[PDB]
C-alpha cells in the first residue's frame, strides 16, 4: 500500500504557561509513535509496537539528534526575528520532513520550514537546492547551500527514511492494519426536533470513512455539512455530519456509514421512529 | 528515525 513517515517540530517564543517551547513528534501512517519536548529533553515511545522493537541506543541516538534540532531552532528564532526587523511578539519556526512510499513504487521526500505559519523554505531534491518561498528566505538559501546539506538530505529522503519506514511498518503492521468498528448515533434538534439532524461515527480505525445522508433512500448532499475527521484519546477517530431538514421530516433520513470494519454499508436512523 | 544531520535545519 502507501506508507508515510513524518517528523514535525515547532519552536515557539510563547507556548505558553507551563508548556514546552520546543516539541518534536513522529508519525507512521498518520499515527503518533515518538515524542520529544524541551522540558524532558528525551525522545520517548508513544506506541507499544515501537517500544520492545527498539533498544536503548535507538532512543539515545534519537534524543541526541532532537537535542541538536532543539538548539538550532532556538537560534533560528533569534536569526529570523533580527532578519525580519521584529521587536518581540509571538513567533514560530516549524519543520516537516519525511518520506512517502507510493503505490507505484516511487518515492516522495520532504524537508520544509515555515516562519510564523507561512512557507519559508522547501528542499527540492530534484534540483539539489533549497527553494526560498519568501525574500527573507534568500539569505537562508545561500547559507544552507554553502553548508553542503543537499547530498546527505537527498540520501536521507530517498534511502534512510524509506528503510526506517519499512522497519516501523513491519513492527506495527498489526496495529496499523487493525479495524475498529464505529458506534453510530443519529440525533436531531429544533422545531419538534427535526431541523438539524446529526450523524456521529464514534471510534473507528483506520481513518478512511464515508458518512452520507439518504432521504427516502436517495443520496442527499444538499444542506449537508461535515466536521471532518477528529481524533479520540485512544488513537481511534470521530466524525460528525449534519443535514438541515424540514421540521417533521426526521423519519425520511438515514445516515450511511462506509468503513473497512463494516463488510456492507451501515444504515442508521434517528432512534426507531423518531 | 530523524536525519542525523540536524544542521540541515539551519535558517
Amino acid at each position: 500500500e502507501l506508507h508515510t513517515l513524518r517528523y514535525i517540530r515547532t519552536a515557539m517564543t510563547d507556548p505558553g504557561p507551563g508548556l514546552p517551547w520546543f516539541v518534536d513528534v513522529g508519525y507512521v501512517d498518520g499515527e503518533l509513535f515518538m515524542h520529544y519536548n524541551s522540558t524532558a529533553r528525551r525522545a520517548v515511545p508513544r506506541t507499544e509496537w515501537i517500544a520492545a522493537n527498539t533498544d536503548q541506543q535507538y532512543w539515545d541516538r534519537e534524543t541526541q539528534i532532537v537535542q541538536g534540532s532543539e538548539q538550532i531552532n532556538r537560534e533560528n528564532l533569534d536569526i529570523l526575528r533580527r532578519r525580519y526587523n521584529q521587536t518581540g511578539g509571538s513567533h514560530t519556526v516549524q519543520w516537516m520532513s519525511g518520506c512517502d512510499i507510493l503505490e507505484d513504487g516511487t518515492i516522495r521526500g520532504y524537508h520544509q520550514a515555515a516562519y510564523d505559519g507561512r512557507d519559508f523554505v522547501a528542499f527540492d531534491k530534484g534540483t539539489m537546492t533549497l527553494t526560498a518561498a519568501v525574500p527573507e528566505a534568500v539569505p537562508t538559501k545561500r547559507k544552507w547551500e554553502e553548508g553542503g546539506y543537499a547530498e546527505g538530505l537527498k540520501q536521507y529522503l530517498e534511502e534512510t527514511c524509506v528503510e526506517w519506514l519499512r522497519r516501523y511498518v513491519e513492527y506495527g503492521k498489526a496495529e496499523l492494519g487493525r479495524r475498529e468498528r464505529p458506534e453510530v448515533r443519529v440525533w436531531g434538534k429544533e422545531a419538534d426536533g427535526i431541523l438539524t439532524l446529526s450523524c456521529r461515527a464514534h471510534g473507528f480505525y483506520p481513518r478512511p470513512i464515508v458518512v452520507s445522508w439518504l432521504k427516502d433512500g436517495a443520496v442527499r448532499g444538499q444542506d449537508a455539512q461535515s466536521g471532518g475527521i477528529v481524533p479520540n484519546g485512544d488513537g481511534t477517530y470521530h466524525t460528525w455530519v449534519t443535514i438541515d431538514a424540514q421540521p417533521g421530516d426526521g423519519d425520511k433520513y438515514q445516515c450511511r456509514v462506509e468503513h473497512a470494519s463494516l463488510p456492507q454499508p451501515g444504515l442508521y436512523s434517528w432512534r426507531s421512529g423518531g | 528515525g530523524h536525519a542525523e544531520e540536524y544542521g540541515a535545519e539551519t535558517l
Binding site: 515547532t10 513528534v25 509571538s90 505559519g117 464514534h202 471510534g203 477528529v230 479520540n232 484519546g233 | -
Partner: protein, 99 residues
Amino acid sequence: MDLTPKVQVYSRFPASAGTKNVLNCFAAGFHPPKISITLMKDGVPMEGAQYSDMSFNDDWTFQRLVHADFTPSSGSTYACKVEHETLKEPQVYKWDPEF
C-alpha cells in the same frame, strides 16, 4: 497571519446518563499555537483533563485535543471554553449529549 481556532466537542462513545465515557474538545486551524482549552461541567473545570502535545497539519496550522474521563449526568451542561489571541473574549462550545 493569525487564524481562529475551529472547535468541536464530542464524546468518545455515544452517551447515556450514568455510563462511563470520555469528553473531547478538539481545536484546529489556529495560529499562534498558544491556546487555553478547558473542559467544563456546568461552567466549572473538569478534573482529569489530558492535553495532547503540540501538533500541526499540512497547512502549518496548529491542533490540540483535550480529553477527560467522565460519567455524564442528565441535566448537566458540558462545555469547552477556548481562549485564543484572535478571539475578543473566551468562546464556549456546548456539548450535545444526544440523549
